[PDB]
Amino acid sequence: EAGITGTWYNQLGSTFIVTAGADGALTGTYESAVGNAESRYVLTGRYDSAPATDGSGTALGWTVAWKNNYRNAHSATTWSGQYVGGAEARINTQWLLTSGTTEANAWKSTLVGHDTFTKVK
Amino acid sequence: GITGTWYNQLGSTFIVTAGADGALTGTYESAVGNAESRYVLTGRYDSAPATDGSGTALGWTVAWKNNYRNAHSATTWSGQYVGGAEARINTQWLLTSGTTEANAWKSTLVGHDTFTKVKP
Amino acid sequence: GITGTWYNQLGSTFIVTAGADGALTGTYESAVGNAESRYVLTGRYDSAPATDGSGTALGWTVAWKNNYRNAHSATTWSGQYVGGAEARINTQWLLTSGTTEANAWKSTLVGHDTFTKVKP
Amino acid sequence: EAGITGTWYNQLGSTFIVTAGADGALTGTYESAVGNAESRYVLTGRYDSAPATDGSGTALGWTVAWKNNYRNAHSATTWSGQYVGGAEARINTQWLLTSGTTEANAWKSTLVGHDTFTKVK
Ligand SMILES: O=C(O)CCCC[C@@H]1SC[C@@H]2NC(=O)N[C@@H]21
Ligand SMILES: O=C(O)CCCC[C@@H]1SC[C@@H]2NC(=O)N[C@@H]21
Ligand SMILES: O=C(O)CCCC[C@@H]1SC[C@@H]2NC(=O)N[C@@H]21
Ligand SMILES: O=C(O)CCCC[C@@H]1SC[C@@H]2NC(=O)N[C@@H]21
Residues A47 and A80 sit within 8 Å (Cβ to Cβ): no
Q: Which helix (H) or strand (E) holds C34?
A: none
Minimal-distance CA residue of chain A relative to B97: A59
User: What is the Å distance from ligand 3's center to C107 Cα?
Assistant: 14
- To 10 degrees, the CA torsion angle through B9, B13, B17, B18? -20
Q: Residue C100's domain is classified under what CATH number? A: 2.40.128.30
Instruction: Say if residue A83 is exposed, middle or buried (CB neighbours under 10 Å; 0-12, 13-18, 19+).
Output: buried
Tally of structural domains, chain A: 1
Annotated ligand binding at D8? The verdict is no
Task: Note down the domain range covering A59.
Answer: 1-121
* Beta carbons within 10 angstroms of residue D85's beta carbon: 17
Q: Which of C62, C56, C96 is nearest to C79 (CA)?
A: C56
Determine whether B36 is exposed, middle or buried from the number of CB atoms within 10 Å of its CB (0-12, 13-18, 19+). middle
Please work out whether the CB of residue D35 comes within 6 Å of at least one atom of ligand 4. yes
- Beta-carbon contacts of D91 under 8 Å, excluding residues fewer than 6 positions away, are D4, D8, D16, D60, D81, D82, D83, D84, D116, D117, D119
Looking at residue C20, the DSSP 8-state letter turns out to be T
Window 63-92 of A: residues touching D by CB (8 A cutoff) are none
